């Protein structure tokens, strides 16, 4: 009852059919510029468009090499390698790798999941080829860019009840690694997501080379010259949810926010953020995750972060997105450093909004001198200096339970009130707020 096919060419017809069970035989399959054309295997993008429903696709031991030149072969159009439009499909075990570093002519996404109740599991994805590569988003990720971009992102989860499970996503590309737009009940489970980092000092060292950053005098979209002393990801987010987007289910076009995301047992390394879901609606749940060397650990806005860990080497493990944040319940272990500290944000956590219940745990005994838990105040975060992104900084914190089971000191700013702090030691806690209560445990 399984059909086995032995070429990309014989695979492509099944993608238009419902209720099929298909296996692409073990092997290595290359897609090159010569394969894209009128006459040719791939006449249109997306390359692999899964239009059927109730189908299973087994790619065990399949290595699919897609030459990045393919991202230029469709004019000025977005190129998608794989898109699922149908429902109730299961794709498993494919190893997909972009070959070379050619940028898209416009933009690209490796995998887009529309429809409902689809699952991608056991994939291994390597994303390459984008422009500019080497500055992350410092010179723009959307309109009004200082340096025009031609982005290439990994997995875009949309649709309803779509699931990415046990996947390895390695990004060497300027774009999101795993992101959700218009997704309702998306689940990301057992995933390993990895980007790579570069110091702003190394970028600034391009002064006088004629580099694209050197040509705009390192002026960022945040309104100031790129500051020294930060470690950035070259990618946009590890797992990031958006409040906008369009998806398609059953031939209906749907424009909505992401809602009800669940992230379980993921490891995110060297990304801008491990898990950011503050812009999703409904119930946000994060459990069993490990965030290593990201610019930011967990920002879910409201909801539940439980049994999660992050290290602090490049940025805070925890950040309330806005003063509007309420009901963020979190239990976060500050993990031993995965590498030397290079955290220019001067904070292990930034807390405000109201009615949160936050527990931080750590075995760390050597505390860098610039790192503290902040309740309110002026965060020295790369993106929020000098009034940039003003709603994401300098905001009040009220009625918050803060269990500091760590040796990190705590700084309660004058805008904080009714913070109930319990701590290993209470002599590293600076209280400049109102009606805050400090108690040793």
Author numbering: 1 to 441
Article, verbatim:
FdlA from Flavobacterium sp. SA-0082 is an endo-type fucoidan-degrading enzyme that cleaves the sulfated fuco-glucuronomannan (SFGM) through a lytic mechanism. We show that the FdlA-NTD adopts a right-handed parallel β-helix fold, and possesses a substrate binding site composed of a long groove and a unique alkaline pocket. Our structural, biochemical, and enzymological analyses strongly suggest that FdlA-NTD utilizes catalytic residues different from other β-helix polysaccharide lyases, potentially representing a novel polysaccharide lyase family. Here, we report crystal structures and enzymological characterization of wild type (WT) and eight single mutants of the catalytic N-terminal domain (NTD) of FdlA, revealing its unique substrate binding pocket and identifying the key catalytic residues.
We first measured the enzymatic activity of 12 mutants and found that eight of them (D137A, K141A, H176A, F179A, E236A, R240A, Y242A, and Y242F) almost completely abolished their activities, H279A mutant retained approximately 65% of the activity compared with WT, while mutations of Asn243, Arg272, and Tyr322 to Ala only negligibly affect their activities. In the WT structure, both Asp137 and Glu236 form hydrogen bonds with Arg272, while Arg272 participates in the shaping of the alkaline pocket. In both D137A and E236A mutant structures, the side chain of Arg272 switches to the opposite direction compared with that in WT due to the loss of the acidic residue (Arg272 in E236A mutant also exhibits an alternative conformation similar to that in WT), and partially occupies the deep substrate pocket. These results suggest that the steric hindrance of Arg272 in the two mutants may interfere with the substrate fully entering the pocket and hence the correct positioning of the glycosidic O atom, thus resulting in the complete loss of activities of D137A and E236A mutants. We found that the inactive FdlA-NTD mutants exhibited similar Kd values as the wild-type form. These binding assay data clearly demonstrated that while our inactive mutants lost their catalytic activity, they maintained their substrate binding ability.
